[PDB]
Amino acid sequence: RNKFNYNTRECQTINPSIRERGVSTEPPPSDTICGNITQ
């Protein structure tokens, strides 16, 4: 009107996506033997 007409603008940022992923470890295995003593 008195200040001349303004000018529209646009800006947007980069929005990464949210993912839900779940993984597992495991208890390592073990061995259990029995032996006798030789002569």
Added chain:
Amino acid sequence: EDEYDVKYQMYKINARGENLFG
């Protein structure tokens, strides 16, 4: 038709400049 059409488009860019300068 063509005559008043080109007149109309001239009038259009006229209005563009006039609204630019307020």
